[PDB]
Amino acid sequence: DHLNLVQTALRQQEKIERYEADLDELQIRLEEQNEVVAEAIERQQENEARAEAAELEVDELKSQLADYQQALDVQQTRAIQYNQAIAALNRAKELCHLPDLTADCAAEWLETFQAKELEATEKMLSLEQKMSMAQTAHSQFEQAYQLVVAINGPLARNEAWDVARELLREGVDQRHLAEQVQPLRMRLSELESGGSDRVDEIRERLDEAQEAARFVQQFGNQLAKLEPIVSVLQSDPEQFEQLKEDYAYSQQMQRDARQQAFALTEVVQRRAHFSYSDSAEMLSGNSDLNEKLRERLEQAEAERTRAREALRGHAAQLSQYNQVLASLKSSYDTKKELLNDLQRELQDIGVR
């Protein structure tokens, strides 16, 4: 006496009535939970809008900073070329004594100094032959003058020419009567025995020769070192100095002209760079703005981070609220299925 199918059939009807009630209970639970989700859905769109507005401002500033930086690095290039142009102008203002010099007129000042350059070389070359051999004429005028002082003694340099010639004349005739000592001894030795009083004429002309031979010995060498370099003593030695004085002047002019013309050439070559005053005058200012823009960017990226973190923080809170709603669905889905199955099973068995 088991398996009373009549109890089963009515117990199955009982379960059906519970599932119908459970489903009507979950229905309210679903709508109440959907209100919670829908509310968070909206707060998520508010966070999405904050995020996109931060993401876009960051991009705008990154592009602004990209363009402004590239242009700035070019301005720096011109600022440097400018100060180099000013430097050149300054150097030319000192070498060339032109305190109010400008780049516009430096073209004509150049050719004014280029001419000053070649006139210092074409006049300097004209005084080329005289100079080199003026050093020799001066070295020989001294070698000679000192030879004369060695023989004659102290005297003025304008008196050396006349003296020098005389000394050579004496040396000439002193050598002629110095080379008589032997012809005279011949006559004396062949007439020493006895005496006709001629011995007095010869013994005296012989002593005249002995003293002249001593003269040749004392001065013969210096007069030899003096014969080739006599003519120079005619010359005025203060013209050698006057000549080398003017050489030095014409050398200094070329030394100054070569460099002056060179400094002006620099200014001309940099003529265009003088119009970069704008770039240099506002380099530090624009660099300050560039760093305030880079600062501005870093602020936005911080606001973008604070936006991506808040958007994520609430997304998780939305996900949790969605987890419970998904559960209610998984239950309603399966319970409505169980209600359909057991419904049809009652219909098929037939026992009521």
Side-chain angles (χ1 to χ4, degrees):
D1 56 356
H2 293 331
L3 55 69
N4 184 1
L5 309 186
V6 184
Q7 303 308 144
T8 304
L10 294 180
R11 277 179 278 169
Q12 290 179 2
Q13 181 65 9
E14 286 180 358
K15 198 103 195 196
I16 284 175
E17 271 110 71
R18 262 189 305 280
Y19 284 154
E20 291 183 344
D22 290 337
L23 292 173
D24 294 24
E25 187 172 9
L26 289 173
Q27 183 66 45
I28 300 294
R29 275 247 62 197
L30 284 163
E31 298 164 19
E32 279 163 3
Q33 252 299 303
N34 210 35
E35 256 194 323
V36 179
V37 173
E39 220 160 355
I41 294 295
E42 288 179 344
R43 307 190 216 112
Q44 193 63 15
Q45 310 317 290
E46 301 180 341
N47 300 336
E48 281 282 12
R50 181 190 206 269
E52 298 303 328
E55 163 271 297
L56 186 141
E57 163 161 303
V58 170
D59 299 0
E60 172 63 286
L61 297 178
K62 274 196 181 183
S63 73
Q64 288 184 3
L65 185 64
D67 286 356
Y68 195 82
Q69 182 67 20
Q70 202 191 234
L72 187 68
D73 298 332
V74 172
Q75 183 186 1
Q76 184 189 139
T77 293
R78 288 156 192 171
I80 291 165
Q81 280 146 14
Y82 176 79
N83 285 270
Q84 296 299 331
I86 300 298
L89 191 68
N90 289 329
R91 221 179 78 91
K93 282 179 169 170
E94 296 297 344
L95 308 184
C96 319
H97 309 283
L98 308 169
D100 302 347
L101 175 64
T102 73
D104 296 7
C105 71
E108 297 193 5
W109 263 122
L110 175 63
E111 57 189 337
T112 296
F113 275 95
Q114 287 173 305
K116 173 59 192 175
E117 172 178 297
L118 293 187
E119 66 81 68
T121 68
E122 289 181 354
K123 187 224 292 182
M124 172 170 161
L125 198 156
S126 77
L127 319 185
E128 178 183 352
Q129 276 283 0
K130 298 192 180 184
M131 186 61 240
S132 301
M133 65 202 219
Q135 300 180 355
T136 66
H138 185 70
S139 72
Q140 295 201 347
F141 185 101
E142 273 294 318
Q143 285 178 354
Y145 170 77
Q146 286 151 284
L147 284 175
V148 179
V149 176
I151 301 154
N152 173 285
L155 76 173
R157 305 181 194 255
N158 53 273
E159 299 170 339
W161 170 244
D162 291 1
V163 170
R165 184 202 165 267
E166 168 56 17
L167 276 61
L168 304 173
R169 185 185 135 289
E170 299 190 10
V172 164
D173 59 60
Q174 289 296 79
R175 289 189 323 268
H176 185 261
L177 79 97
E179 59 203 18
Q180 305 294 317
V181 174
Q182 274 288 5
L184 294 182
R185 280 202 198 269
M186 281 223 60
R187 318 216 318 204
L188 189 68
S189 73
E190 198 61 22
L191 200 67
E192 171 48 74
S193 60
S196 177
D197 306 0
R198 273 213 151 193
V199 298
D200 300 328
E201 305 181 275
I202 314 316
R203 191 171 295 95
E204 212 67 359
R205 273 182 247 268
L206 192 146
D207 189 58
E208 170 179 21
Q210 285 185 332
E211 286 285 283
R214 178 188 58 85
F215 179 92
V216 175
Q217 261 207 327
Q218 188 168 2
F219 311 105
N221 276 337
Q222 301 107 290
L223 274 59
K225 296 306 305 300
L226 179 60
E227 191 180 342
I229 60 173
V230 194
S231 52
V232 63
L233 299 170
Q234 287 174 116
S235 306
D236 190 326
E238 312 195 60
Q239 288 172 25
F240 158 79
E241 202 155 305
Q242 187 76 295
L243 169 56
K244 84 170 177 172
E245 290 185 4
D246 294 313
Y247 188 77
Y249 181 80
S250 79
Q251 241 299 21
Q252 263 299 146
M253 297 300 87
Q254 180 189 4
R255 206 181 309 280
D256 302 353
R258 276 189 78 113
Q259 194 56 216
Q260 283 163 336
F262 169 79
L264 305 189
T265 296
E266 280 238 292
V267 178
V268 174
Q269 294 176 348
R270 309 170 184 275
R271 192 175 204 251
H273 300 166
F274 289 98
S275 64
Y276 298 166
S277 44
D278 48 68
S279 304
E281 291 166 1
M282 308 183 306
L283 187 65
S284 55
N286 292 4
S287 286
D288 183 73
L289 296 178
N290 186 79
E291 264 59 3
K292 300 313 185 190
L293 180 63
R294 179 153 161 80
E295 176 181 342
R296 217 182 198 272
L297 174 63
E298 197 160 345
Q299 308 291 29
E301 260 184 319
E303 178 56 40
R304 184 182 68 174
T305 300
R306 300 160 110 84
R308 294 201 209 256
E309 189 129 8
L311 174 145
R312 284 199 68 202
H314 205 270
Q317 193 188 144
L318 172 71
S319 191
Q320 289 162 4
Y321 299 157
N322 175 261
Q323 292 283 3
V324 313
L325 182 63
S327 294
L328 301 170
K329 291 158 137 188
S330 180
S331 290
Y332 191 108
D333 292 351
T334 56
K335 295 302 193 296
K336 201 173 201 170
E337 278 173 3
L338 294 168
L339 176 58
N340 269 263
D341 304 1
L342 192 134
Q343 265 175 301
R344 169 169 266 185
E345 170 140 323
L346 268 181
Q347 177 278 333
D348 194 359
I349 180 164
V351 171
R352 178 173 68 246

